[PDB]
Amino acid sequence: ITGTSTVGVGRGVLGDQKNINTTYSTYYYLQDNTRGNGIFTYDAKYRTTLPGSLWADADNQFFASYDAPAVDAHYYAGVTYDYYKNVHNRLSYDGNNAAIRSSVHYSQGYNNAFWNGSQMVYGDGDGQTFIPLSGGIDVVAHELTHAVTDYTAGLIYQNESGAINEAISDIFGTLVEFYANKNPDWEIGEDVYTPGISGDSLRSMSDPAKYGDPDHYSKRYTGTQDNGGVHINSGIINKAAYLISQGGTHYGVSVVGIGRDKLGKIFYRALTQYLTPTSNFSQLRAAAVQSATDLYGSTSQEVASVKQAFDAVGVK
Numbered sequence: 419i420t421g422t423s424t425v426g427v428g429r430g431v432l433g434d435q436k437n438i439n440t441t442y443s444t445y446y447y448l449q450d451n452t453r454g455n456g457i458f459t460y461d462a463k464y465r466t467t468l469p470g471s472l473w474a475d476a477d478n479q480f481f482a483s484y485d486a487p488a489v490d491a492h493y494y495a496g497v498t499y500d501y502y503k504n505v506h507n508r509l510s511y512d513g514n515n516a517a518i519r520s521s522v523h524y525s526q527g528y529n530n531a532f533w534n535g536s537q538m539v540y541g542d543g544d545g546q547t548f549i550p551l552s553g554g555i556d557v558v559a560h561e562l563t564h565a566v567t568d569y570t571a572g573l574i575y576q577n578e579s580g581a582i583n584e585a586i587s588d589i590f591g592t593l594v595e596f597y598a599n600k601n602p603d604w605e606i607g608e609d610v611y612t613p614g615i616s617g618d619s620l621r622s623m624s625d626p627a628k629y630g631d632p633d634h635y636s637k638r639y640t641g642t643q644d645n646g647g648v649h650i651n652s653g654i655i656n657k658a659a660y661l662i663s664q665g666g667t668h669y670g671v672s673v674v675g676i677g678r679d680k681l682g683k684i685f686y687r688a689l690t691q692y693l694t695p696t697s698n699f700s701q702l703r704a705a706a707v708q709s710a711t712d713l714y715g716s717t718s719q720e721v722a723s724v725k726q727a728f729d730a731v732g733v734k
């Protein structure tokens with residue numbers, strides 16, 4: 419909508435207070451004009467028709483319980499936009515400042531979030547398995563990164579290319595969590611997952627096997643569930659990414675860590691320059707080695723650590 423840009427205040431899913439960019443035109447709308455062609459947050463009103471209604475508020479204060487998922491969806495979309503612009507010089511998910519749209523209050527008791535090809539969608543959770551999923555910055559950045567992938571490598575969402583697709587979203591979801599310095603870790607979804615159980619998460623990049631996901635190519639899932647295990651076999655790539663950044667010894671192979679920033683540069687270059695819709699794990703290794711070579715040289719420690727990490731998880 420057309421109107422005057424301003425700043426509102428509210429509280430997010432976890433009770434933290436934050437400022438949010440809004441637009442004033444009779445109502446205050448969750449429309450952020452400061453980032454590209456805009457960030458728009460919609461109310462799905464417990465239905466499944468999308469996008470719903472552009473979020474309208476009478477007084478520019480968002481402290482109601484019903485407001486919390488919208489505040490966080492809106493705010494964390496902005497942080498993720500900032501990450502890609504400031505760190506990778508990318509303007510929104512299409513590289514041309516496409517508008518970012520999110521809908522919250524999707525369905526009833528819906529324990530998931532997703533990119534549907536055009537926008538982000540967030541359930542409120544059932545209060546037991548999940549609380550509203552926009553409360554996790556790594557979740558929001560995970561979903562928005564699916565849009566980046568769709569507009570770049572276009573990895574098909576099945577089998578090995580789909581597991582790469584999932585891992586990319588976990589990797590950059592985590593790097594955004596570190597970028598915002600919001601209690602960062604190498605776990606996925608810990609802030610919104612099982613509010614009754616402390617210390618757990620949906621997936622672990624540092625130790626995928628903690629939750630039964632494979633940490634080595636020999637342990638990959640080969641069945642048909644989960645589109646061929648796109649959320650399961652991502653653990654193999656997640657572990658490799660963790661080893662590249664932090665280092666360690668895994669199945670007897672030692673990796674020297676090179677840090678989060680170089681991990682991000684290497685995988686972003688592989689995603690945007692070398693990966694294709696049908697890339698498999700072996701081709702991801704080649705893309706990451708080539709990207710490390712482009713950036714740091716064929717004889718660099720960086721190239722060495724990429725090779726070691728994929729050796730450690732058994733990807734040749």
Ligand SMILES: O[C@@H]1[C@@H](O)[C@H](O)OC[C@H]1O
Pocket residue numbers: 482484
């Ligand atoms: O309080 C909530 C209200 O803000 C929303 O608009 O509709 C559902 C209610 O529970």
Ligand SMILES: O[C@@H]1[C@@H](O)[C@H](O)OC[C@H]1O
Pocket residue numbers: 483484485486487542550
């Ligand atoms: O009002 C929402 C409620 O419907 C849901 O159950 O928990 C999250 C709240 O935002």
Ligand SMILES: [Ca+2]
Pocket residue numbers: 475476477478479480481
């Ligand atoms: Ca209000």
Ligand SMILES: [Ca+2]
Pocket residue numbers: 595600601602603608609
């Ligand atoms: Ca965290």
Ligand SMILES: [Ca+2]
Pocket residue numbers: 556592595602603604605606607608
């Ligand atoms: Ca996390």
Ligand SMILES: [Ca+2]
Pocket residue numbers: 608611612613614615616617618619
């Ligand atoms: Ca928990």
Ligand SMILES: [Zn+2]
Pocket residue numbers: 560561564584587
């Ligand atoms: Zn995903």
